[PDB]
Amino acid sequence: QVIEFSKYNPSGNMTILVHSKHDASEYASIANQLMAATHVCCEQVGFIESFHLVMSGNEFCGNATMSYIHHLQESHDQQFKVKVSGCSDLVQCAIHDCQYYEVQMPQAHRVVPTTINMGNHSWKALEIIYETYVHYVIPVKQVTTEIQHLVEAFVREQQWSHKYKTVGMMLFDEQRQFLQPLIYIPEIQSLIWENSCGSGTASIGVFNNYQRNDACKDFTVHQPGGSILVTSKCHQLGYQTSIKGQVTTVATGKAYIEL
């Protein structure tokens, strides 16, 4: 089977968009084969349906949506809405100058200040609960190898609610505006140090709102291999959060897969 696809670089965390038409039933299988082919994580494989974006696991994905906006600008500055998988409403998107793209991010259902015990120390954290995942923003003086091992041990040892497809441990150096993101998938007990779908960047915006009662506007969140901006603020509407980042096209072509 011939898959027509493009590979994108939203701030060092690469995505794939499939341009060729396929049965929605095949999407999970095609994405797994593209993941082996291209070394891109399945959650960051999207299908462009004929403006409509379907992620391989039917979830919302910020940096894949940002890649889709880049594709539309490149393929053919404005505000518009896109239909994306995992959303009840259309998603607000914007094209900005200098190949910056902005995407509305999932609304936090609740934030709770907490402490986590890792080794024999207590760490202040903000627990940010979304529909299908939870992030812990953990302020740090600096990210160390020791802290990374403690966070890995911590998530592995905890019993996690089945509500949460993923658990995020978002180590945030506030002064350096540096995020070291860890995504844990409880189902398959896998850990990956990557800001999957740019979700952690949005969580930093919510953290800033909670911590300072100050709106975020183009707040820079440095991470390994790039930078993403977060805007975050609205009475009974709750947290309104978007991320903004540069996307470049890495490659375009045809992949060859089985079936």
Compute CA distances 240 → 8, 68, 92, 106, 162, whole Å.
26, 21, 11, 9, 26
Is the Cβ–Cβ distance between 99 and 70 less than 8 Å? Answer: yes
Query: What gap in Å lies between CA 159 and CA 147, rounded to an integer?
Result: 20
What does DSSP say about strands 178-185 and 166-173: parallel, antiparallel, or unpaired?
antiparallel
Q: Say how many residues make up the chain.
A: 259
Q: Is position 197 annotated as part of the catalytic site?
A: yes
- CATH number for domain 2-106+246-256, candidates 3.10.310.10, 3.30.43.10, 3.40.140.10, 3.40.50.720: 3.10.310.10
Is the Cβ–Cβ distance between 8 and 247 less than 8 Å? Answer: yes
Q: Is position 61 annotated as part of the catalytic site?
A: yes
Write down the domain spans for the chain: 2-106+246-256, 110-245
Answer whether 2-106+246-256 and 110-245 agree in fold: yes
Count Cβ neighbours within 10 Å for each residue of 210-240 and write b for 16 or more, e otherwise: beeeeebeebebebeebbbbbbbeeeeeebb
Q: Which two tokens stand for residue 154?
A: 């911590």
Residue from 109, 136, 111 nearest 125 by CA: 136
Angle at 78 between CA 6 and CA 48, to 5 degrees: 30
List the catalytic residue out of 61, 93, 98, 234: 61
Residue from 9, 17, 8, 12 nearest 255 by CA: 17
List the catalytic residue out of 41, 42, 93, 197: 197
Alpha helices in the chain, H assignment, sequence order: 27-38, 62-75, 145-157, 199-212
Q: For the domain bounded by 110-245, which CATH number is listed? A: 3.10.310.10
State which approach was used to obtain the coordinates: X-ray
